[PDB]
Amino acid sequence: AKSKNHTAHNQTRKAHRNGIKKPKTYKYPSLKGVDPKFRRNHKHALHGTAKALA
Amino acid sequence: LPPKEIVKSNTSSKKADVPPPSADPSKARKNRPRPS
Amino acid sequence: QNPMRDLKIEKLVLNISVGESGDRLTRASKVLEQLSGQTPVQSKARYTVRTFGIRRNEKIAVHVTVRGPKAEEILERGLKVKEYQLRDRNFSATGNFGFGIDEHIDLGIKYDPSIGIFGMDFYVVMNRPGARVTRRKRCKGTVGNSHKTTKEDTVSWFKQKYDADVLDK
Amino acid sequence: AFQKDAKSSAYSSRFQTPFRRRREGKTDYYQRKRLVTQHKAKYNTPKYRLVVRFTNKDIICQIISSTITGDVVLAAAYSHELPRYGITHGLTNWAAAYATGLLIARRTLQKLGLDETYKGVEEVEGEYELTEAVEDGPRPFKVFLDIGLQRTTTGARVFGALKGASDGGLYVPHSENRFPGWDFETEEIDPELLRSYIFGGHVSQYMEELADDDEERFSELFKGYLADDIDADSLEDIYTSAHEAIRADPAFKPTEKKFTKEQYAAESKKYRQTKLSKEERAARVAAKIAALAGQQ
Amino acid sequence: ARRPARCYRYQKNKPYPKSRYNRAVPDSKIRIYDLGKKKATVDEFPLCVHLVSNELEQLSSEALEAARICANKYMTTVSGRDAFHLRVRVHPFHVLRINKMQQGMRGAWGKPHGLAARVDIGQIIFSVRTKDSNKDVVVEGLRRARYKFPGQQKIILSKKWGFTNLDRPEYLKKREAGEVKDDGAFVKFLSKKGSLENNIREFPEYFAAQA
Amino acid sequence: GKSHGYRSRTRYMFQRDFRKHGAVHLSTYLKVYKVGDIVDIKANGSIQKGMPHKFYQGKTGVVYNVTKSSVGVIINKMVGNRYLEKRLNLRVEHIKHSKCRQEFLERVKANAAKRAEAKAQGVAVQLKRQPAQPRESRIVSTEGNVPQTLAPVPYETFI
RNA sequence: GGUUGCGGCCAUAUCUACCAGAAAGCACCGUUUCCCGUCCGAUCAACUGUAGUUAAGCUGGUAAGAGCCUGACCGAGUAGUGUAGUGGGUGACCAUACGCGAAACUCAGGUGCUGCAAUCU
RNA sequence: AAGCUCGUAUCAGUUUUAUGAGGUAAAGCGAAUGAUUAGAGGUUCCGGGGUCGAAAUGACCUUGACCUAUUCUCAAACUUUAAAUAUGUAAGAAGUCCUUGUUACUUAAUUGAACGUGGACAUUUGAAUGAAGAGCUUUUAGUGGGCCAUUUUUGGUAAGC
RNA sequence: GAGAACAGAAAUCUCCAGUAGAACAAAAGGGUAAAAGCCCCCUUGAUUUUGAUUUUCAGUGUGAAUACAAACCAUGAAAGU
Ligand SMILES: [Mg+2]
Ligand SMILES: [Mg+2]
Ligand SMILES: [Mg+2]
Ligand SMILES: [Mg+2]
Ligand SMILES: [Mg+2]
Ligand SMILES: [Mg+2]
Ligand SMILES: [Mg+2]
Ligand SMILES: [Mg+2]
Ligand SMILES: [Mg+2]
Ligand SMILES: [Mg+2]
Ligand SMILES: [Mg+2]
Ligand SMILES: [Mg+2]
Ligand SMILES: [Mg+2]
Ligand SMILES: [Mg+2]
Ligand SMILES: [Mg+2]
Ligand SMILES: [Mg+2]
Ligand SMILES: [Mg+2]
Ligand SMILES: [Mg+2]
Ligand SMILES: [Mg+2]
Ligand SMILES: [Mg+2]
Ligand SMILES: [Mg+2]
Ligand SMILES: [Mg+2]
Ligand SMILES: [Mg+2]
Ligand SMILES: [Mg+2]
Ligand SMILES: [Mg+2]
Ligand SMILES: [Mg+2]
Ligand SMILES: [Mg+2]
Ligand SMILES: [Mg+2]
């Protein structure tokens, strides 16, 4: 038998029950998906800056 | 000796094998000169 | 005011519309070949009509582009065949002109029935100096109206040379 | 302008104009894009082109980088400059291309500092070579050949500037197969022929080929070369002459002051006509309404 | 066979014209839109009376033609074939659909059924030009065509000259000056813009700065 | 049935900004991007490689990666009741430096200026933005400004 | 200021018709031994800068020109639109309140600006 | 439900300001495309008619279609233009600025890139309003037939469809 | 559009105008003019390695696609692709 097909009725109310909430920005964010050639060098760049300060 | 084989090539995009739009029997003439 | 509006012939193109392929064409091209000195160009059929008994891309015509002094030779060599007279039609309003002659043996060349006889379309395309702009690669430009070949100015050039006459109307 | 041809207001309203330097048939933008643009991970380090153009018989060789507000010339060197260096006639021959090539091929490197370093090839036996980098030291200046709308035919003079630019010391990536003396079938190069073209052996041999079969076109063609008593032989040495002459001094000295700029601004503005005032036009057409419609 | 006109009075759907998509549409039942002395000149007929809709509805081509003939007939029959220029100003481009009744209302997309013109409020339906001596007669023509129509529409006297977009004094100022130039049904006007030489061969009567 | 392909419904969104078709002008390849730049996303219908999906049109984000032809842009997409981090590998031709911060940077330099000149003489700093305040009293004169008394206009027809 | 080479914005730059352009520069232009390409040295390649012209290119100016760009309480606070009422109307639809607000039209003005290098009475 | 880490810290179905994106409403058609009424003027060695015609690339009438400047009228799958409402981002200490280490990346180049050291400027520290605080984790129920009203809106003559 | 023996509405040749009115396997919509279309030349990157990303989404899978890394190649004077 034919039932209802689709609605977004009331789905905004549910989303806002526990709200829509901001994306929690982070200083020092991830490096996921950054040019590996850059990462490879940046690695040694910083082991350099690290071993420097001894 | 038959001369060297140089063949002209065409710049026309049209590739279908069909007469163009003006090539229609509509544009002939009834009693055109027809040397007798 | 012309020190430089001095009309040349740019190309002369002969063309025999041999409405079929094979032997008849490869001999009608031989005709232009011992008329031109150059190797002529086979033209393929554009589409297929079958009233003219042809097929698309069938190699049904040959033509040849000849330029400069060698063009004046063949132009006059055929202008004789037409008694140095062609008509007030037969001139493009863009300045060029051409004519047709059957029985191509009236151009000096002998008969040799291993070919037979062919007709030719003569077309003479003309221009003043500095036609380069229209056909060079860099800075391709179009010529001023002051300078383009017109019809009235090119029949007068045709009368003035050759002692031709223009025709009715 | 045939009546059957004039263009509608609709045609012109909806018409998109190309870029000015394309309307002027001067820039291949499709080529410009791929010459200029840089790898985004280098982030200002500019892509220096070696533009090589050809006036009707004068040779232009600037080295230009591009900027959002306009291409900026690092060095320029003109084939009219060779008078300075030992060359007087036909400054469009393949060997003037090589010359100016060499000229900017040394001009920049002193403007840079890699002059004692990266001197290029000096003993020009016409070999195929690139200015290789020095062990434990700066890499050579790298620039690429903007040949504009020239059509890169085998053995053309745009590549003559290349050979001299390369031979002076610039690192300009290039193959050999369009250097005069590239063999069509065997994928190899004749250096004996290319050294000729670098020096003149095709115009020297033109001189020794007209001095005893046609003195009536040698008459005017090459007029200058007789008017200063130097025959063909003898040509390799007006060019090696200059090769030394520029490798010794590249320095661009410019032209003498000679009716300083503001004077030119005066004596050309005589001929620059300026537009008419709106009231002038208003009266200029108000003359016409009286002069034509008002029953003569 | 033709469905009663109440089923399509209102603008319930978005315009459904004949189209590359719709494309099966019957022919409009009204095919001639200018009537009377349509070849006449603008000076021939200064007065203009409109039939204007006061509703936001749809007029069937069936009713449009049916009402033009009823009006145009009355006009000629009492004024003469060339006494008026009748223009109907709404062309019925909107295709009405219909569901042709062992199945149900599964897949119930209609087939084209008839045409209709979609008229706004204040939209002019009939525009007719004559000379003021007629107005009583031609007004009475529109009044009779009105009875062919669903929904109130009202007659109105134009402040304009015939089918021009200028009121009568503004027109006379324009012509008794010499900026109007007759054309087949209509006239052209003297622009202050464009080429001056090409402005003077046409409208030469002007530029005397006088009549 | 229904159709939901990657470029569905993009007809006018990827349309070409009329009388501006053709090869893209070269300034957009001369612009430079560093990690952390805030860029806008508008797709360039001429450049089909590396183009953003329609959802990120009109969207703005931050550069997290730079490569030879492309920037990597970080975008905060709201799916359900929470934002997720979406990472787009976009071609330079679909990317635009953003004036979305330009006030704030123009106004931080101007703030420190007024602050320099505020610790320079008696400290009157006054450099936070306030919204438009309502008007203050003023005196309207009638010298050559005596008023036109307007009445409503009757109903005409005009057609 | 002119001009060229390379440009950025890409019509205020394009289109139509006329007219003017000194100097330099571009250009058109001469040649076919050589590299190179063509049916055709027309294009493309090379050689000369010598033999030749501002005719065209290119620059600038003219036009109640077309197009384009800009402005205006020009139209227009119109059309549309967010919000409100136990507002009017059988309805179709409509007015009012608190806000936002076009497009056409019309008139006015405008017709490329500018970067790097070199060069010029 | 159990809490846990914290607490003037961050927080928001809101406004403001700065900067974006969009092609709906309206509008437009003497702008493109596609429709559509009407005349007026053009144009053929080049559509058919048709007097003079032996014919003519012939004059002439005729109806045709094309061109020109006008005219009435239109579009969910048309459009130059183009709202309202909705929509992305930004409004600082994770700030701004300077000084000059690291690297195998990158540059002609200690050039840049990235990350760093030292240093300079404190709550008018950078709009409004609000905040019985903010953030975080685990586990589990029921539900997964919906229906109605204003507005927008598809199909249907329509329906308490 | 104007022009050239047979040649006709339609064969082949030339010039002029031409913002795309064409063409790009196909449906349609985008997009494209020294091209993305047409002719030619050289080719096998339609290849090798394992990851990240976008769309659908549960932010599973599959399809498809994007931008890098590491190879070995193609093409071009070249930057490039
Ligand atoms: Mg079921
Ligand atoms: Mg049900
Ligand atoms: Mg269900
Ligand atoms: Mg083709
Ligand atoms: Mg002259
Ligand atoms: Mg035959
Ligand atoms: Mg117009
Ligand atoms: Mg190229
Ligand atoms: Mg409704
Ligand atoms: Mg409906
Ligand atoms: Mg039924
Ligand atoms: Mg049943
Ligand atoms: Mg069905
Ligand atoms: Mg069906
Ligand atoms: Mg409407
Ligand atoms: Mg009624
Ligand atoms: Mg009007
Ligand atoms: Mg669908
Ligand atoms: Mg274009
Ligand atoms: Mg692809
Ligand atoms: Mg001069
Ligand atoms: Mg050449
Ligand atoms: Mg002149
Ligand atoms: Mg020029
Ligand atoms: Mg100009
Ligand atoms: Mg104008
Ligand atoms: Mg409202
Ligand atoms: Mg209520």
Ligand SMILES: [Mg+2]
């Ligand atoms: Mg109500």
Ligand SMILES: [Mg+2]
């Ligand atoms: Mg109203």
Ligand SMILES: [Mg+2]
């Ligand atoms: Mg839509």
Ligand SMILES: [Mg+2]
């Ligand atoms: Mg629309």
Ligand SMILES: [Mg+2]
């Ligand atoms: Mg609408």
Ligand SMILES: [Mg+2]
């Ligand atoms: Mg509009």
Ligand SMILES: [Mg+2]
């Ligand atoms: Mg239209």
Ligand SMILES: [Mg+2]
């Ligand atoms: Mg049409």
Ligand SMILES: [Mg+2]
């Ligand atoms: Mg007789």
Ligand SMILES: [Mg+2]
């Ligand atoms: Mg606005």
Ligand SMILES: [Mg+2]
């Ligand atoms: Mg918001």
Ligand SMILES: [Mg+2]
């Ligand atoms: Mg508070």
Ligand SMILES: [Mg+2]
């Ligand atoms: Mg609290």
Ligand SMILES: [Mg+2]
């Ligand atoms: Mg649960």
Ligand SMILES: [Mg+2]
């Ligand atoms: Mg279920």
Ligand SMILES: [Mg+2]
């Ligand atoms: Mg259940």
